[PDB]
Design a protein around this ligand. Structure first.
Ligand SMILES: Nc1ncnc2c1ncn2[C@@H]1O[C@H](COP(=O)(O)O)[C@@H](O)[C@H]1O
Ligand SMILES: Nc1ncnc2c1ncn2[C@@H]1O[C@H](COP(=O)(O)O)[C@@H](O)[C@H]1O
Ligand code: MOO
Ligand code: MOO
Ligand SMILES: [Mg+2]
Ligand SMILES: [Mg+2]
Lengths: 422, 422
């Protein structure tokens, strides 16, 4: 039995970043960059107007002037020089014609004379300064500037920067492919209606398929496997040979006489641990299998108890997926929060207590902060204790009652940007 | 020009939850439940062992006893009664045979005699209590108990609860379908290499496609549209008739003489506003179009400036997607944080200043909390100001320099569970 911090250190030490691949721009979203990106041209590549109005010679000052060209895009005004005593109409993003050194926004101007006559004239109502409302070449992005670097995760703004730079095929770290199976003679498919004696619906498999889909990985669903050593070996050898990077099993890892996951993983590879000092998730097995040519497969013999299964996925499998996906910060967000109710900590095993947390203007102490409500009874067989739980409170093994208003460390396990407000 | 709080109130008031649909279990992930879910049978549906060991009569106490059956799943031990003076082998999740009222874990037992002889005997090493290590029928979930309710978002634990309850087809609120187009004679596709005079790559479209994909919505990519009124009307009528729920355009909404988005939206529907008091995102247009039979289409005439485009998406479009998707808490997470450097606020427009935020053990004041670093120059044409930005600091329009260490409100715009730790 090892502490969770040691089990996390071992998993991290064995887990290796996947070889990079080339993907399309839309396939690059969510992925970590495996190359630096440089701008091939400046942004803007031409002097551009910040406003809809008139490009002027600043030194001319307020007065009435003829409009000698109109510049909105492309070759508009090419070969036209705005000389002292003239102006050019411009729209935002329009190229500044040669000779103009400032832009006066349309609100500080007035058109003079009849619009029907070909010759347009405008009254500039202010005294402007050279450079006003013009984006010089390269002011937003300089040519050859690094706009994105290796190790940076691609979100919407990063896709926008790749498009700005003309990069539609991107070198990234891929997501791992994950195989998932359930174990047990007592299991039936979740499509089962009336259950026969001693049967339960397989809930862990669909739960883990959903959890892995939330981490943006491809899933290989290997179904229900019975408590038969040859059958489980065949399905594990099949998963190892299929090209997946991670295998997730649940159940068949406790002290039962037909719990074959641990001895099969010892036979096929290297088991680093099979027991962890934690509440819930004690029978967790982690192993490294080498697939014959030629790559490493990580195997997590997750516990059968639904709560223990999901907590072990959240604490150990999520950072492993991220490490394989090239994240430099794979660890989960940890915050500090105040308890909204008293919670009794366990006397021997530190607890990952499920909570529903929210940000409050007053956390109970006068200042703003996160607050936590327990999900109730914490039994490892009670999947209702994971319902709506967006955090795991880290309760040390003291045996004391932590009173309402006391502060604890909490691992956030679900999208902080999808947190329901107070 | 209206304040952002009024623009958000108007958008919320017009936006209506989409009609619910029936989807498969894996399609239900991320979606909000449109029906309550009740357990059709209890969990466990039979008295189940919490441990691998022996089912006993508690009153028998420590002693040596014959093992009369073995119970791991299904019909194991059916018709066998554990009477006083006998025990039954059980594995975790195994049905408790009739007559046994407690379980003694295998660690508190010892097998006696030769294993080869058919008759097995075990020594129970402790005095147990009635009910120990047995999960009674329905202790985790009672039959007909409500396990999930209308308005609850489906995450991995909720998929696990649907599978437990045998629900593989779920009534949910769907995500809206979003049409996206760019406007401008100066735009070229992001596949363009060398740019001609007065051209830029279309970056907003791929950025908004990525942003909408992160919100789990289907995208209808309508491409680049030129600054031609008939062309833009045709593409808008096409989007309205196609069945999308939201149209996103960018550009063609400022004061230019070929900015046709506003007048086209006024003609096709009801424009609620076209100008907002905010830095960045001032030219935002919001309109409601009625598609002929027969449904409502929401249209956001987003600003062309890349920063303004993404900030307006993050503040106004993200809660609208969530409201249409049936979220009861569509608003973004707002927290309070301390500035890591000084920031000058604008004297007239309140600013959505881009920041990279992280949780620190000491936020600078001695206690733990969020801290923010600015992304630098905040110009609306500078997409590099959105790079890695996971929050928008809400700076009031005071004109004062907010010093390092002062606290501000911040909107979190990207997965809090994907936050890089300190
Ligand atoms: N799709 C786009 N990608 C990048 N920049 C754009 C896009 N559309 C408009 N812009 C720029 O945003 C600014 C305002 O656009 P508009 O509202 O059309 O005048 C101008 O500088 C445009 O060149
Ligand atoms: N796929 C599953 N879905 C729900 N419960 C399970 C699953 N697999 C195992 N269990 C339960 O978890 C507990 C421990 O399983 P095991 O480690 O196989 O003894 C037992 O009560 C099992 O019935
Ligand atoms: O042995 Mo556990 O910690 O109830 O899965
Ligand atoms: O007019 Mo803006 O607020 O630079 O898009
Ligand atoms: Mg089992
Ligand atoms: Mg334009």
């Amino acid at each position: 039995m090892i502490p969770t911090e040691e089990a996390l250190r071992i998993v991290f030490g064995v887990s290796k970043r996947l070889p990079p691949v080339i993907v399309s721009l839309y396939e690059a979203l969510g992925k970590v960059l495996a190359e630096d990106i440089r701008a091939p041209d400046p942004l803007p590549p031409y002097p551009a107007s910040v406003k809809d109005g008139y490009a002027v010679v600043a030194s001319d000052g307020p007065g009435e002037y003829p409009v000698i060209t109109e510049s909105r895009a492309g070759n508009d005004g090419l070969g036209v020089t705005v000389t002292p005593g003239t102006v050019a109409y411009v729209t935002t993003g329009g190229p500044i014609p040669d000779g103009a050194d400032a832009v006066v926004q349309v609100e500080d101007t007035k058109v003079i004379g009849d619009v029907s006559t070909e010759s347009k004239r405008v009254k500039i109502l202010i005294q402007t300064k050279k450079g006003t409302d013009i984006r010089r070449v390269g002011c937003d992005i300089e040519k050859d500037a690094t706009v994105l670097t290796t190790g940076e995760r691609i979100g919407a703004s990063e896709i926008g920067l790749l498009a700005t730079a003309g990069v539609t095929m991107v070198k990234v770290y891929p997501m791992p492919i994950v195989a998932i199976l359930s174990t047990g003679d007592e299991l039936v498919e979740p499509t089962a209606g009336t259950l026969g004696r001693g049967q339960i619906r397989d809930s862990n498999r669909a739960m883990l398929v959903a959890a892995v889909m939330q981490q943006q990985c491809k899933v290989v669903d290997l179904g229900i496997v019975r408590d038969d050593r040859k059958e489980l070996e065949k399905v594990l050898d099949e998963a190892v040979s299929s090209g997946v990077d991670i295998i997730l099993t649940s159940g068949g890892v406790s002290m039962g006489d037909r719990d074959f996951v641990k001895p099969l993983l010892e036979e096929k590879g290297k088991v680093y641990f099979s027991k962890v000092l934690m509440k819930p998730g004690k029978p967790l097995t982690f192993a490294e299998i080498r697939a014959k040519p030629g790559k490493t497969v990580l195997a997590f013999g997750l516990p059968g108890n639904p709560v223990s299964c999901l907590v072990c996925f959240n604490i150990f499998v999520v950072p492993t997926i991220r490490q394989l996906a090239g994240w430099t910060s794979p660890h989960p967000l940890r915050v500090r929060l105040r308890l909204q109710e008293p919670i009794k900590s366990d006397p021997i095993r530190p607890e990952f207590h499920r909570a529903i947390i929210k940000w409050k203007d007053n956390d109970g102490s006068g200042t703003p902060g996160f607050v936590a409500e327990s999900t109730g009874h914490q039994m490892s067989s009670r999947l209702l204790s994971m319902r709506s739980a967006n955090a795991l409170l880290e309760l040390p093994a003291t045996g004391n009652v932590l009173s309402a208003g006391s502060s604890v460390s909490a691992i956030i396990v679900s999208d902080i940007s999808a947190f329901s407000i107070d």
